[PDB]
Chains A and B, each alone.
Chain A
Amino acid sequence: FNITETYLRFLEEDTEMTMPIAAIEALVTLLRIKTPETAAEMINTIKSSTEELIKSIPNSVSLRAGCDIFMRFVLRNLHLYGDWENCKQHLIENGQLFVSRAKKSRNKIAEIGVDFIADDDIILVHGYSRAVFSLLNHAANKFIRFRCVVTESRPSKQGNQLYTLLEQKGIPVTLIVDSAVGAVIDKVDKVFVGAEGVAESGGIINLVGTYSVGVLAHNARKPFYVVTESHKFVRMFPLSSDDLPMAGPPLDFTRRTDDLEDALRGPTIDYTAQEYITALITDLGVLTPSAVSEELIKMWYD
């Protein structure tokens, strides 16, 4: 009963919702039509829907991660081996319940995460993730000595947007180009990066440039930070230094031109290794080193 349309429906919304959360909700809604009782009629349909979504996907792995998590949850659900109605009801409940959860997670974050701020520490923020922004705003709320540094990101002018968002807060800020980020090593005390997908080992999928930043941090011995909630978990491991399922160009040397038509071709999404990250920020208590892998193991058991 459609899912692509639902996905499309969320573009100018957000800020209050959460794309992957929305997707999950949509999935749940789809599920509560074709009966969760008959497993043959339902699971296959769900799979088909997921395939369709993948086909319609441009540059996103997080939705897939969400859907597989949902599937896993569903599978777990039927372990009670009792009546087939209560379980169904629970499943039905668990969609808006997921939406509700996000708020609670945020709340949890905003009380433990505020302990990290030290006296006169300058913070650089990279990537458009809602969680990081929330953390920042709720740190301002707490009233702690802090500074904000903006990086000039170029997918569809994201850095500028981030800067603008920061402005409507009242915090003094300065914009730095992604090429010029290397020179800033002593002034910025902590390097903060948001994530779009957390892998097996603890590797991060995000945006236009993260790996380089990580490398720089390693070189300067400055702490590297990953800020996320709890829905972006993929059972994946990259083969090379940077490899992802992409709809865009993986390094394309364009043919001989004069009038300029196609030139903007290359890497858009980047992967960073486990060694670079020193601290991980999540709502599930406090966990850092290799907890994601453990979580995955718990989930899949395979």
Chain B
Amino acid sequence: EDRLQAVVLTDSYETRFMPLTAVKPRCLLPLANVPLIEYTLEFLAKAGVHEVFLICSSHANQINDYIENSKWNLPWSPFKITTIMSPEARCTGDVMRDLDNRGIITGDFILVSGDVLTNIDFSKMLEFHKKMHLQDKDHISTMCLSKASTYPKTRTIEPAAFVLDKSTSRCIYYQDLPLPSSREKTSIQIDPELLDNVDEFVIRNDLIDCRIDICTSHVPLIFQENFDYQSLRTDFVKGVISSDILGKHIYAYLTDEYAVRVESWQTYDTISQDFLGRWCYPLVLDSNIQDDQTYSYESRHIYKEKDVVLAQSCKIGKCTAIGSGTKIGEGTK
């Protein structure tokens, strides 16, 4: 149950943020006046990590410098940071292959794509993963899913329609749609390969992407074997479903609480807003994670750091956060 390594897929979704990501790395950019990597690290710690592995290629020197400056570099940390340096521009298949070539993969390794910050406890999830693994020999990887805001309308980039089972919690079909953004394909597809075995068919769309994966030792080997799979969601899961290797199982964990990954700009903004509010149960800035931080809590969802100066007679609305060393004048709304 103990001793688990972590591999974080960083510097993967560049140019997706169309204006930025050209001079400085993607993940180093602050979410709420503090870098996005830190949150991820915290999450990993919460989960249970014993060694840290980061994938860097685009502006790696800066990342290295940050690591050197960071708190985990000092000997007190249970997990040490050793970066994977690779040639410029490659897909997640290639990265996996590279990892395999090196060879650190042992047991149930954690693979996280992008940067995710969520409130849900992970120990229970791990236990579940273990128990399910103990059921049958040929079990692969875990996927994380959360209940959406009743009706989907702000989701156009990744509105995945998940056809799911209640008894085993296993995915049947994966499909992407441009339906709300462009009225060309308002569409649904179901394959008949697993109709006369599951019986309990539940068709759903309202589920948000997390992209946190708990993976067995089989996965890198699989990746090595089938080199056609460049991506991990669109081609891989579908392949697994359509019996690439016969008699195999995958997981789709269901949670009522909030869990969303960073993907675009509006989504990022929404995430930030959520963070500002009391959406995440323990994740608050006033606790101070980076140790240099001096955030304190105030009434009506207002965050104020130390050495924050605000002038008299300024009417404020709802949910505001101010960073350290600020000088604000008069007559501001």
Q: Could you tell me which A residues sit within 8 Å of B by CB distance? A: 119, 143, 145-147, 171-172
Is B312 touching A172 in the complex (CB atoms < 8 A)? yes
Is B302 touching A119 in the complex (CB atoms < 8 A)? yes
Is B309 touching A119 in the complex (CB atoms < 8 A)? no
The chain A residue sitting closest to B327, CB to CB, is A143
Instruction: State whether the Cβ of B299 lies closer than 8 Å to any Cβ in chain A.
Output: yes
Query: How distant is the Cα of A147 from the Cα of B299 in the complex, in angstroms?
Result: 18
Query: How distant is the Cα of A145 from the Cα of B304 in the complex, in angstroms?
Result: 12
B298: contacting residue among A119, A147, A171, CB under 8 A: A119
Closest CB of chain B to A95's CB: distance in Å?
41
Is B299 touching A119 in the complex (CB atoms < 8 A)? yes
Which B261-310 residues have C-beta < 8 A from chain A?
A: 298-299, 302, 304, 309-310
Closest CB of chain B to A234's CB: distance in Å?
39
Closest CB of chain A to B323's CB: distance in Å?
15
A-side contacts of B304, CB under 8 Å: 119
B-side contacts of A143, CB under 8 Å: 309-310
Closest CB of chain A to B236's CB: distance in Å?
51
A-side contacts of B312, CB under 8 Å: 145-147, 171-172
Query: How distant is the Cα of A119 from the Cα of B302 in the complex, in angstroms?
Result: 10
B-side contacts of A145, CB under 8 Å: 310, 312
Closest CB of chain A to B305's CB: distance in Å?
13
Closest CB of chain A to B44's CB: distance in Å?
35
Query: How distant is the Cα of A203 from the Cα of B310 in the complex, in angstroms?
Result: 37
Query: How distant is the Cα of A119 from the Cα of B310 in the complex, in angstroms?
Result: 10
B-side contacts of A146, CB under 8 Å: 312
Query: How distant is the Cα of A143 from the Cα of B298 in the complex, in angstroms?
Result: 16
Inter-chain pairs besides A145-B310, A146-B312, 8 sampled, C-beta below 8 Å: A119-B299, A119-B304, A143-B309, A143-B310, A147-B312, A171-B312, A172-B312, A172-B313
Q: Could you tell me which B residues sit within 8 Å of A by CB distance? A: 298-299, 302, 304, 309-310, 312-313
Query: How distant is the Cα of A147 from the Cα of B314 in the complex, in angstroms?
Result: 13
B-side contacts of A147, CB under 8 Å: 312
Closest CB of chain B to A174's CB: distance in Å?
13
Query: How distant is the Cα of A290 from the Cα of B310 in the complex, in angstroms?
Result: 37
The chain A residue sitting closest to B298, CB to CB, is A119
Closest CB of chain A to B118's CB: distance in Å?
30
Closest CB of chain A to B193's CB: distance in Å?
61
Closest CB of chain A to B145's CB: distance in Å?
40
Query: How distant is the Cα of A145 from the Cα of B316 in the complex, in angstroms?
Result: 13
Query: How distant is the Cα of A119 from the Cα of B304 in the complex, in angstroms?
Result: 10
The chain A residue sitting closest to B315, CB to CB, is A120
Closest CB of chain A to B328's CB: distance in Å?
10
Closest CB of chain B to A149's CB: distance in Å?
14
Closest CB of chain B to A119's CB: distance in Å?
5
Closest CB of chain B to A162's CB: distance in Å?
19
Closest CB of chain A to B295's CB: distance in Å?
15
A-side contacts of B302, CB under 8 Å: 119
The chain B residue sitting closest to A171, CB to CB, is B312
A-side contacts of B310, CB under 8 Å: 143, 145
10 contacts across the A-B interface (CB closer than 8 A): A119-B298, A119-B299, A119-B304, A143-B309, A143-B310, A145-B310, A146-B312, A171-B312, A172-B312, A172-B313
Closest CB of chain B to A138's CB: distance in Å?
15
Closest CB of chain A to B303's CB: distance in Å?
11
A-side contacts of B309, CB under 8 Å: 143
The chain B residue sitting closest to A146, CB to CB, is B312
The chain A residue sitting closest to B309, CB to CB, is A143
Closest CB of chain A to B312's CB: distance in Å?
7
Closest CB of chain A to B331's CB: distance in Å?
13
Query: How distant is the Cα of A224 from the Cα of B266 in the complex, in angstroms?
Result: 48
B-side contacts of A171, CB under 8 Å: 312
Closest CB of chain B to A172's CB: distance in Å?
7
Closest CB of chain A to B332's CB: distance in Å?
13
Query: How distant is the Cα of A146 from the Cα of B311 in the complex, in angstroms?
Result: 9
The chain A residue sitting closest to B308, CB to CB, is A143
Interface centre among A119, A146, A147, A171 (most CB of B within 10 A): A119
Query: How distant is the Cα of A8 from the Cα of B298 in the complex, in angstroms?
Result: 50
The chain B residue sitting closest to A172, CB to CB, is B312
B-side contacts of A172, CB under 8 Å: 312-313
The chain B residue sitting closest to A119, CB to CB, is B298
Query: How distant is the Cα of A146 from the Cα of B310 in the complex, in angstroms?
Result: 11
Closest CB of chain A to B298's CB: distance in Å?
5
Closest CB of chain A to B311's CB: distance in Å?
9
Query: How distant is the Cα of A146 from the Cα of B299 in the complex, in angstroms?
Result: 16
B-side contacts of A119, CB under 8 Å: 298-299, 302, 304
Closest CB of chain A to B315's CB: distance in Å?
10
Closest CB of chain A to B234's CB: distance in Å?
49
Query: How distant is the Cα of A1 from the Cα of B302 in the complex, in angstroms?
Result: 63
A-side contacts of B298, CB under 8 Å: 119
Query: How distant is the Cα of A143 from the Cα of B302 in the complex, in angstroms?
Result: 18
Query: How distant is the Cα of A172 from the Cα of B299 in the complex, in angstroms?
Result: 24
Interface centre among A143, A146, A172 (most CB of B within 10 A): A143
Query: How distant is the Cα of A245 from the Cα of B39 in the complex, in angstroms?
Result: 68
Query: How distant is the Cα of A241 from the Cα of B269 in the complex, in angstroms?
Result: 62
Closest CB of chain B to A148's CB: distance in Å?
10
A-side contacts of B299, CB under 8 Å: 119
Closest CB of chain B to A118's CB: distance in Å?
8
Closest CB of chain A to B325's CB: distance in Å?
12
Query: How distant is the Cα of A267 from the Cα of B36 in the complex, in angstroms?
Result: 67
Query: How distant is the Cα of A12 from the Cα of B306 in the complex, in angstroms?
Result: 41
Closest CB of chain A to B20's CB: distance in Å?
34
